From a paper:
Isocitrate dehydrogenase (IDH) catalyses oxidative decarboxylation of isocitrate to α-ketoglutarate. NADP+-dependent IDHs are mainly located in mitochondria and cytoplasm, and play an essential role in cellular defences against oxidative damage as a source of NADPH. To investigate the effects of Cd2+ on IDH, we determined crystal structures of mcIDH alone and in the presence of 20 mM CdCl2 at 2.0 and 2.5 Å resolution, respectively. The structure consists of a homodimer in which each subunit comprises a large N-terminal Rossmann fold domain and a small C-terminal domain and β-hairpin clasp.
In the structure obtained by soaking a crystal in a solution containing Cd2+, strong electron density equating to a Cd2+ ion was found in the active site. This Cd2+ ion is coordinated by three carboxyl groups from aspartate residues, namely, D275 and D279 from one molecule, and D252 from the other protomer of the dimer. The guanidinium group of R109 and the carbonyl oxygen of A308 also participate in Cd2+ binding. In the active site, unexpected electron density was observed near the nicotinamide moiety of NADP+ that reaches the sixth position of the octahedral Cd2+ coordination. In the crystal structure of IDH soaked with Cd2+, another region of strong electron density was observed close to C245, with small areas of satellite density, indicating the presence of a second Cd2+. We placed a Cd2+ and two water molecules at this site, and the geometry of neighbouring atoms was found to be suitable for coordinating the putative Cd2+. Thus, interaction of Cd2+ with C245 was observed in the mcIDH crystal soaked in a solution containing Cd2+. In the crystal structure of the mcIDH–NADP+–Cd2+ complex, the cation is coordinated at the active site in the same way as Mn2+ or Mg2+. Because Cd2+ was coordinated with residues from both subunits, Cd2+ successfully brings the two subunits together to form a functional active site, as shown in the crystal structure. The crystal structure of mcIDH with Cd2+ reveals a closed conformation with an α-helical regulatory motif.
Author numbering:
A (entry chain A): 4 to 412
B (entry chain B): 4 to 411
The structure:
């Protein structure tokens, strides 16, 4: 077996938790020896530890520089009842990203045989999603009745306290929230986006809504311009690429009619939403990579961008055949292992991480596919059961195809 | 000429302001006589009136129940320099939607001969965008340096204050903002969405992020469920349709791969962003309806959902040929006139509003179209100037076909 090194692993929930075991059992552990630091981020063990396991996992990623994460449940009211939880725990992803910081870079996994839903996307679209702040570290509450909601800033220095009226509720109640972001975090966000654009050789676009959030989003736009003009403007010219700020609604329209081949710097919320749209446009939520690259340049957290796929977990619980796509969870392992190999100049691990990705593509392009991708080719009404493999047949086929590729080399 | 009635009109900026005139002079007032109350909401007069023109127009819509609005400029810092304005004026749309409230219903305008960019959308997607609150009535500010940002609630009855920590900036500054929403507005939002689904015969989906905004977005989710179970669930089952809540990121993916045929209840921000994504998916940003339906059930504001097309306006300024799609601006008039005809039982005006929309569709499907629609057919690189009409020849042909349809 290859000696892989130290890797922080985080277990998830429902359908992805099951696929996670198959990946470890059929594709990884037979060929790689790892100092696997495992953290159960399943909903029950997060509840049992009062979510401390989530903060422990984040700290381990700081120590060992590589984390691979399975999709997890973020509970609302209906999940508190289903699992008898103590409280509505925050998203484990929000907690992990808030401790590490950085940019979540997402990108579709492309197969030559899979038609897109968007006709023009002949090149990849890479989304750089800011991983900090905004709605994912906000403080929201219900306004019970009439009253004023105000937002106040108290400076650390000589007091110049400022009180802003949010809304005076004259009758009835409602909702209110405050959210924030950090100058330093936005600077890291900008650097990560300019570097990625230059590294790939593609233009870079940043989307905000600064016409409406004039000071909030205007900070994002200004900091990108300043960093561009001071550190990156010349290297952009030398590579024959450009940087441009666009309104977010203009940007989604341009992306929809684009040919692809650009970097898309997104604020936290838009990066969430638009990365599922892009992934689905290219084929399936199961065909997309997601890597949190930290500002240190050395630490990464690879993950599946999709959720736990509970709707498929429901069918599995009623003993109905499931055809869930494991590729995004598999590429979380391979991308994490690839970065682990790059930190240690591990030749054998680099080759294994590439071979494991090559096996996924080669298998799909040969006609062996989960139902989601078979629907891309034939159209959902024209799909028969012969057109695809169930969840377990597909991972059986990847396990066989990987064993053969590794036996050959 | 037809006796149209009282209609509030709001002029806009740049390329849309040019197109707006052409519509009035070629397609409306030659055939309709209207008590037209015109408000110049262009950036020039909004500055001159200190945006009092925008508040005046919104008040006029409340009295006369029908407003038609041209696309306008929302100024950034970079447009304060271009016209040397007093301040960064707020969005006239936000101001108008805030005074009226309600839901902005958006839907693509379909033509037989125009391929989509999204393969599977064979049925219409209608987005119901909540028009009140959230980012569009928010208070944002720059955090200059280290300090504490808190949000407070003081009840009116004099009971105890509650303060929540937003963020303690230990080093450096950043940004912060507060935003809110109102129960009654959410209820009106929910009623309009269940009713529209029942009117169209399609299922209804609401998108929020209640796993993250547990109390803020949970309120939206809970109020829809309560209104569904108590008032609309039984009529839904009788019509073989349904309502379901979905997280926004799952929702945008489902919509992308769907066949269409559903109502999409969106919060203010998502309704903004996603309606331009859907419009571009079907063909072009200029082929989309946008109608603000107020909770009172009588007043309505139709608009062009797109922007002012400044890229074409720059070419227009530099004396270069343009090919801008006027149909969204044309439909704002027809939708406005149609509702005016519904309130006055004006059979003739009802017919005129439909004839004007049919002529637009019939024109494109006969092969006479703007460049954006020609690019949908041939692909933008393979489009020649013989493949399309410019902005002014296209509205010339619409004038001819509309006069012929009305005479016959
Ligand atoms: N990274 C994360 O940890 C993360 C991200 C998002 C959501 N979540 C959590 O996951 C739970 C479910 O959320 P959700 O259902 O809204 O999001 P989701 O699990 O990503 O959505 C599942 C739906 O999207 C499609 N889909 C997603 N992944 C797929 C795959 N690998 N193969 C085939 N189809 C796939 C399926 O649509 P069809 O039903 O049409 O097959 C499925 O029903 C929630 O509790 C949420 O908190 C976690
Ligand atoms: N409803 C409103 O009043 C509204 C909404 C949004 C923005 N705005 C304002 O508009 C100003 C700038 O405009 P924007 O950023 O929104 O740009 P935009 O008008 O969305 O135009 C962006 C691109 O979309 C295409 N496009 C849009 N409308 C079109 C039409 N009717 N026919 C053909 N092509 C069309 C053009 O594509 P090409 O690249 O092919 O030219 C154009 O370059 C902003 O200051 C903002 O305040 C107003």
């Amino acid at each position: 077996k290859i000696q892989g090194g130290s890797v922080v692993e985080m277990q998830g929930d429902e359908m992805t938790r099951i696929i996670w075991e198959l990946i470890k059992e059929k594709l990884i552990l037979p060929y790689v020896e790892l100092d696997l630091h495992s953290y159960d981020l399943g909903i029950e063990n997060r509840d049992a530890t009062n979510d401390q396991v989530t903060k422990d996992a984040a700290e381990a990623i700081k120590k060992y520089n590589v984390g691979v994460k399975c999709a997890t449940i973020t509970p609302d009211e209906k999940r508190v009842e289903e699992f008898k939880l103590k409280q509505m725990w925050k998203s484990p992803n929000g907690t992990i990203r808030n401790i590490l910081g950085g940019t979540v870079f997402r990108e579709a996994i492309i197969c030559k045989n899979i038609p897109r839903l968007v006709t023009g996307w002949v090149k990849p679209i890479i989304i750089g999603r800011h991983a900090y702040g905004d709605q994912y570290r906000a403080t929201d509450f219900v306004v019970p009745g009439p009253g004023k909601v105000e937002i106040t800033y108290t400076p650390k220095d000589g007091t110049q306290k400022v009180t802003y009226m949010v809304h005076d509720f004259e009758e009835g109640g409602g909702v209110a929230m405050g959210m924030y972001n950090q100058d330093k975090s936005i600077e890291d966000f900008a650097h990560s986006s300019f570097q990625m654009a230059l590294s790939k050789g593609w233009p870079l676009y940043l989307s905000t809504k600064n016409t409406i959030l004039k000071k909030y989003d205007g900070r994002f736009k200004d900091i990108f311009q300043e960093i561009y003009d001071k550190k990156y403007k010349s290297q952009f010219e030398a590579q024959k690429i450009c940087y441009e700020h666009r309104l977010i609604d203009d940007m989604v329209a341009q992306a929809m009619k684009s040919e692809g081949g650009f970097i898309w710097a997104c604020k936290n919320y838009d990066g969430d939403v638009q990365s599922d749209s892009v992934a689905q446009g290219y084929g399936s939520l199961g065909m997309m990579t997601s890597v949190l690259i930290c500002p240190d340049g050395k630490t990464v957290e690879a993950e599946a961008a999709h959720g736990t796929v509970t709707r498929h977990y429901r069918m599995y619980q009623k003993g109905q055949e499931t055809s869930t796509n494991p590729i995004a969870s598999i590429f979380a392992w391979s991308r994490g292992l690839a970065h682990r190999a790059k930190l240690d100049n591990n030749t054998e691990l680099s080759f294994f991480a590439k071979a494991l990705e090559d096996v996924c593509i080669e298998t799909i392009e040969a006609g062996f596919m989960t139902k989601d991708l078979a629907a891309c080719i034939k159209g959902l009404p024209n799909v028969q059961r012969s057109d695809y493999l169930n969840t377990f047949e597909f991972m059986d086929k990847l396990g066989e195809n990987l064993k053969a590729k590794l036996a050959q080399a």
